[model samples]
Target: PKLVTWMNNQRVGELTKLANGAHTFKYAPEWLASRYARPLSLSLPLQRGNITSDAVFNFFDNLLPDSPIVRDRIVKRYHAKSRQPFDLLSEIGRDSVGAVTLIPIMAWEKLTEARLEEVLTAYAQEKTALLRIGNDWCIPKGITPTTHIIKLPILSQSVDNEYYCLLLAKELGLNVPDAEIIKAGNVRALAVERFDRRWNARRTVLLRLPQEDMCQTFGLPSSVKYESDGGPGIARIMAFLMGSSEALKDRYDFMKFQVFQWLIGATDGHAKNFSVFIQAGGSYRLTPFYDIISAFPVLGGTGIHISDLKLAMGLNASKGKKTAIDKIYPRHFLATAKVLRFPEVQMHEILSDFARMIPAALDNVKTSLPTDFPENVVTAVESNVLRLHGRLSREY
Candidate 1:
């Protein structure tokens, strides 16, 4: 079996499954010759030769959800043979997080509000859906790509939690996509505008920009997304940013994002959560942050206690061990900066600045909250930020 990979409606590559069960990908000759040609992934560059490695498999595989339950749902929904990427992605890959779309050679592939409610309930995970202003939205059909990603509330107040976090991130001057809380009957979901999609000058066409996550860049499977789980750590990510087109700005933005995550007690800053835009000639830059949900609201109790909470990637600690988020302090970031070759003074300044900005940033975010916004989420995040700010202010 084979799938054609596309970006911006142009053939980028072809992925083929061998008789021996190995997967291979090769850049299309026409795509390579086009001015818009870019590597599907940093792991799979724009070479003319065929790539027959796990890198090819890992890159496409990472496009699907990391949750086994979600994969099972997809397999069942699409009647796919298995939970493998090839099968699952072939069905749902028309509209994914980034620009790439995998389609079968044979064919290319809608709902009302109540019908959308039924569809949303049936597929209870993150899904790409078409959004029409003034309350008309549905899942796209047949070669039509989705404009926004709809995430149904999983935990208590998850939709509002993520919405608040994203709003706070934007308040702090971090790049974030437009996100809003939407309702269908009793179901409320977060609809985040796709950063990889945009309108042309005439507003007639939606263009797809090429992008990939850190895992794709590092050529790792999504199963090992956490740094502790053999994925790229902060140090590696910072080092990789040195090759970015805007290295200084991107590195500083990356550092700021890490600090912001800490301020909000975010526990899911994994490699798969960070991404980069793939530019022509193989250069790339960091994309806007997404999937940020704070652990503050759920902290403490029988499960996921404060002590049990840890950042997906750790900070530099003693004896070369990565330090947990709770154990991390200003000194740990300084150590990480030194090891990653970032000036310690600048790192200290960034921390100090974030600490100083907490009160105002929180105030700004609070003012922007809706009348019925979740109070527990706001208070939890505020208290957590104040506590961390106190620590940083005292130390730095």
Candidate 2:
């Protein structure tokens, strides 16, 4: 299963499998003149010549599901190598995690859209797979990239927690993608429209806008996506944002999102949860938010004390001190802004908006919560969302 990688149709590299069960990727010299003259990922910047970098090879490997269930299912279905990237990519790489597409040595054809679709959904699952949606929010049957990501419930008795959290995000007037809760059999799935995928003005051509999560941008393995495992933090993220042309705007959007995440009790917000979209010629912008969820209520509380409720990771350099969410207050946000070098006036303005609108936003969320959800589940989430506004404003 010898393969070549393409970045939006431009040939970028060749990947080969070695006898030792190792895989290698060598960039083409022609790549220097193509639109992807730079590495598809900022972290995998172009090497001096056609060279095999283990880091680049590992990047593609990480795109596939490492989950025991999803991985075993894919291997069994394709009869492809379970750990061999070359064989796996050939079977599952046409549409992948990001902008890159991998094509095998076999002749290409107008294969049925569904034929290879299941093969290409390579994500390790939050116990979910990424699939496309069409008109009326239907799953597309034709040969085209998907418009929405279909996320199945990972936890038993999930109660549409992420769908509800996204609904809450939309109500707060935050930059969030469109999401819908879909019923499949007895289980529920969330269909979130992809911001990185779009069609042209005439809706004739599907385009894959380049995007990279914080891990890819910061050059960390996807396995260590959580900040607690040595992934990037607010300080690292701000440093990178400062290099973007839209620094101020991205910074402001990021600040607002953090405040919103804090309010929703988003305990799972980590480095991988945030991303940036890269346009032709190398300008970058913060992507519309996705994967926002309130895990606190579902995973249950850790400690009796409010100060013990922690975020997925601490903000800024804690100097070995705990910076859990409850330990943080509005005053701490001011301190955070100063540490991140955020503009004083803008920080104040964003927090002011949260103080003003978040209560009603929670009410808006509660009013539209899924009717099919258990009454107690609804009550608990409502209680959590409604309780946040007071603390954010109390210290103001």
Cα-based lDDT for every prediction = 0.81, 0.67
Candidate 2's TM-score reads 0.84
Residue 289, candidate 2: C-alpha displacement in angstroms:
2.1
User: lDDT tens digits, residues 21-90, model 2?
Assistant: 5666667778766663756667666654544556666566666664656666667777975645666777
lDDT of 1 by residue, 58-172 (tens): 9988888878888888888889978778888788887777788888911211356687677667653556566443356754445556678888877578889999999888887
Model 1 lDDT on a 0 to 1 scale: 0.81
TM-score of every candidate: 0.93, 0.84
Clash number for each model: 2, 0
